[model samples]
Target: MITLHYLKQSCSHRIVWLLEALGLDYELKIYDRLEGTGFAPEELKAQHPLGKAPVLQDGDLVLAEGNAIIQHLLDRYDTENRFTPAHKTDAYSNYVYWLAISASMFSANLLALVSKKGDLGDFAQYTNAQVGLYFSHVEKSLEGKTWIVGEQLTGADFALSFPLQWGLNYVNKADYPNITRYLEQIETHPAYLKANEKTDGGLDLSRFAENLYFQ
Candidate 1:
């Protein structure tokens, strides 16, 4: 069985969502970031140098990083329903584009959030503006589409989802109706609901919900 070294509120939520969607049975080793004890405990450094959560240990093979873990799980175990497109398809192009965008866009949003003055300046503004543009493009893309790729709910959707949810709150959903609608779809999805149920006790919803930008 795949053993997931998961923290309560890290990006591990994405892994939980993917695992549930894949209908896989695995062991969950829960950890917490609380002061003195829990998942962030120093003991974890044996597993990873950073001692961070969301580390996937399959037998002797160990994996780290959130998006990489998501892709690895879907690619290695999801044969019943292919969520990740093969590397050469046009679908793969969109997959890589939005998957990469999700992480980069989120980083930009996080930077803006951490800025004390809340001014992006010209360079930051230009970067933030690009993320906004991507959101607009996605909003337009989701105009008549149910999923990020074709009609299927693929790994690309999971890849783009977390940041998309964050973007909806930060970018002013009213200005991006289609993206808001897409987020609603993702929020209401059974997989998302299930992921939420497990996130608090098994992972970290509080951190995600309490983000300054999200509030």
Candidate 2:
């Protein structure tokens, strides 16, 4: 069984979604940041020096980074097709693209928030515009496809969900119809609902400009 060390409202949600999609057995070790500080729990420090969330442990193996965690899960339990492409297809190319792009979106959003630039202003507009361009690229890429790659949902689709949702919640998404539709598709998926139910706590972080920081 995998032992997943997760922050209450963080990217770990994607890991839970991936595990549930695979029908794998796992346990969640919850971590909380100290009040007024963004530090991780003491227990996490022993598992990951970075003290980050979504750290996975299976037997003697430990993994950090959410996109890598998602890829690992797909590699391990995806032979029967939980939506991961074979290595040589164009679909696989799109899969890799979305994975990196979604991660980029997350990193950019966090950096904007950490730099205190989330508010509407010149900086916010510039940053949001850059994110908009990324979404536009995705929109164009997704125009003729049901999922990011092929007709079937893959790990790429899962990877794409969070950033689009973040965009919908923060950046204006109506301008990106394809992305909005894509997020709507995944939000209704059973695995996503189950993951959300298992992970979301009533942590109100409205003071962070209505952004939930970790979700």
Candidate 3:
């Protein structure tokens, strides 16, 4: 059986969503942040040395990192490639690119910007500009499509969901019509709603927004 080490109101929500989307029967070992400090508890380290949430356990196999966990689940569970395109295809390449962006550049710049918010510093301005550039690129990328890579939903959608939802609050949703529609799509997805219910209301942006560097 598959088991997930989940932290309430964290990126683990994406894993829950993916499990629901794949119709998997899994156990969720829930954790809570340390009150007042907003940090993962020390006990989480026993799950993995890094002490992070969203760790997936398949019997003796243990995995961490949201992107890595997502990819692993897609590889092992999504046998029909339902949430992924076939490897080496053009669409597959595009899907990988977005996944990389979601985990690396986009995530880094967002954290930098959020950390430096309200500070009148040069680094803050630089990070803000970096985030703006990526946001515009994403806006243009989604102009003519419903999902990130192709017509169907893929891991890219789940990978990008957290950033896209948080970005909507920081950036003007009105200015990015496609992104706004994408958020609506996520909101209305049955699996997403079901996942939310499973995760005890899922991501609370007010708490999630305060921390962007969670593993």
The local distance difference test score of each candidate is: 0.69, 0.72, 0.80
Q: Using Cα atoms with residue i matched to residue i, what is each candidate's TM-score against the true structure?
A: 0.79, 0.83, 0.90
Question: Any runs in candidate 3 off by more than 4 Å, and if so which?
Answer: 114-120, 206-208, 212-215
How do the candidates rank by lDDT, highest first?
Answer: 3, 2, 1
Give candidate 2 regions above 4 Å deviation: 33-39, 114-126, 200-215
Which wins on lDDT, candidate 2 or candidate 3? 3
Clashing pairs in 2: 83-154
| Model 1 accuracy (lDDT, Cα) | 0.69
lDDT of 1 at 159: 72
Model 1 lDDT at residue 72: 81
Candidate 3 lDDT: 0.80
Query: How do the residues 62-128 of candidate 3 rate in per-residue lDDT, one tens digit apiece?
Result: 9998789899999899999999987889899999889887776446555666658567588777776
Best lDDT goes to which candidate? 3
Worst 10 residues of 2 by lDDT: 202-211
Error (Å) of candidate 2 at residue 127 is 3.2
Report the lDDT of model 1 for residue 108. 68
Error of 1 at 141 (Å): 2.5
